Amino acid sequence: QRQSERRKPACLPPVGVAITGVPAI
Amino acid sequence: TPQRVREAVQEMLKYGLLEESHKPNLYRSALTNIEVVDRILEPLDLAMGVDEVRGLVFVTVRQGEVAEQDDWSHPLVRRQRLNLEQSLLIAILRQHFIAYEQESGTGASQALVAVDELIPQLQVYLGELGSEAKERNRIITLLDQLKGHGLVSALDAHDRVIIRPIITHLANPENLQALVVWLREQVEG
Amino acid sequence: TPQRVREAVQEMLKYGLLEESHKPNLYRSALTNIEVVDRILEPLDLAMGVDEVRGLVFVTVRQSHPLVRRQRLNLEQSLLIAILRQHFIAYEQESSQALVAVDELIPQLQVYLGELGSEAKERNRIITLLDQLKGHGLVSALDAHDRVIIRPIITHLANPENLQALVVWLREQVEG
């Protein structure tokens, strides 16, 4: 019932990380 | 450097994963050149994970000598961190994937779950809103947030979502144990 | 492989440019490790170019590249690129950072694209063009006193082929 607790970040490594959209060029 | 190896590396880095069911040629090219791919990706601080049983080639953060690099401070990482609501939704989807995988045999099949089935289970924890519209909008927002991480896909015409097998590597038992310990410490004090 | 070298290479490839005024430590690390950066970027068909006059370390496609996308600009952007380039040339002939006022570029654009008859239209067009050039990383953020900062990359804007095309198009627009 607390929004702050529900939005507290957890610890899970990123899996299947794609490219950063574009090389910014 | 072989052209196929370079193309497989480019596609895998662009998308984050390669599936044999859709890209069998790229999957075989990257699978047969593990040492070359590792050598190429070593300067980038990245590592490659392969699941031949499920046919997937994904990219994760390479582990250095640093005890806690946080796996999120890598310059090439673009995505945001994960909170508790999305974590519970991911755990529920993992349970659904387990249920799908238990009674499965040979043949090409997909894990599809309707939203209405998922609504009461998440209402059990989060609670229930006055109107069904509010809960439906909240669930759609959460599903869009998780689709941004590539765990699911867009809804079809029959109000269903597809659970990608990548969650199997997201909810591997080591990460599950780590998150369980962290949440237990969060509750206890 | 040194951590500083990897960080400098990653940042340089992420942004495409490195300035000592912004990242002096990374600039020194890359400038003292030319051979290491060249070896790292060799399999990627990329090379490091150094401009010690302005401290600009850029990435050039050594040799139409898998990791580099080619996009063309319109005349409404080409003429503003010419205006900013000539302003920066005038500033560097005066011998820091080239400061160009927003009101400065209004007549230089109106004499070529006509007069829209409204100050609001001129301001909106100037802001949109400046933001479009910001998308390419050619200038800095707008200042409080309606001024922008021109980056040293304008010196290394492109090869003389694009400069000749730019001057030809500018002369054509002046002809009208």
C15 near C137, Cβ under 8 Å? yes
Amino acid at C15: Y
What are the DSSP calls for C12-49, one per residue? HHHHSEEETTT-HHHHHHHHT-HHHHHHHHTTTT-EEE
Single out the residue of B174, B126, B165 nearest to residue B18, CA to CA: B165
Helix (H) or strand (E) holding B20: none
Q: Is residue B10 within 8 angstroms of chain C, CB to CB?
A: yes
Chain B, nearest residue to A17 by Cα? B16
Query: What's the gap in Å between the CA of B9 and the closest CA on chain A?
Result: 11
Give chain A positions within 8 Å (CB) of B73.
Answer: none
Give chain A positions within 8 Å (CB) of B81.
Answer: 9-10
Query: What's the gap in Å between the CA of A14 and the closest CA on chain B?
Result: 7
Which residue in this structure is represented by tokens 């929004």? A3
Q: Coil, helix or strand for B60?
A: strand
The 8-class DSSP code of residue B135 comes to: H
Q: Coil, helix or strand for B113?
A: strand
Beta bridge partners of A9: B83
Alpha-carbon span B12 to B1, nearest angstrom: 17
Alpha-carbon span C18 to C58, nearest angstrom: 6
Amino acid at B139: I
Single out the residue of B60, B84, B54, B55 nearest to residue B72, CA to CA: B60
Give chain C positions within 8 Å (CB) of A20.
Answer: 14
**What are the structure tokens assigned to B150, written together?**
């590539």
Kindly list the distances between the CA atom of residue C132 and the CA atoms of B5, B60, B82, C128, in Å, as whole numbers in the listed order.
36, 34, 33, 6
Alpha-carbon span C1 to A13, nearest angstrom: 24
Amino acid at A8: K
Amino acid at C69: R
What are the DSSP calls for chain C, one per residue? --HHHHHHHHHHHHHSEEETTT-HHHHHHHHT-HHHHHHHHTTTT-EEEEETTTTEEEEE----BTTB------HHHHHHHHHHHHHHHHHHH---PEEEEHHHHHHHHHHHH---S-HHHHHHHHHHHHHHHHHTT-B----TTSEEEE-GGGTTSS-HHHHHHHHHHHHHHHH-
Alpha-carbon span C46 to C58, nearest angstrom: 10
**What are the structure tokens assigned to C104, written together?**
């400065």
Q: Reported resolution in A?
A: 4.1
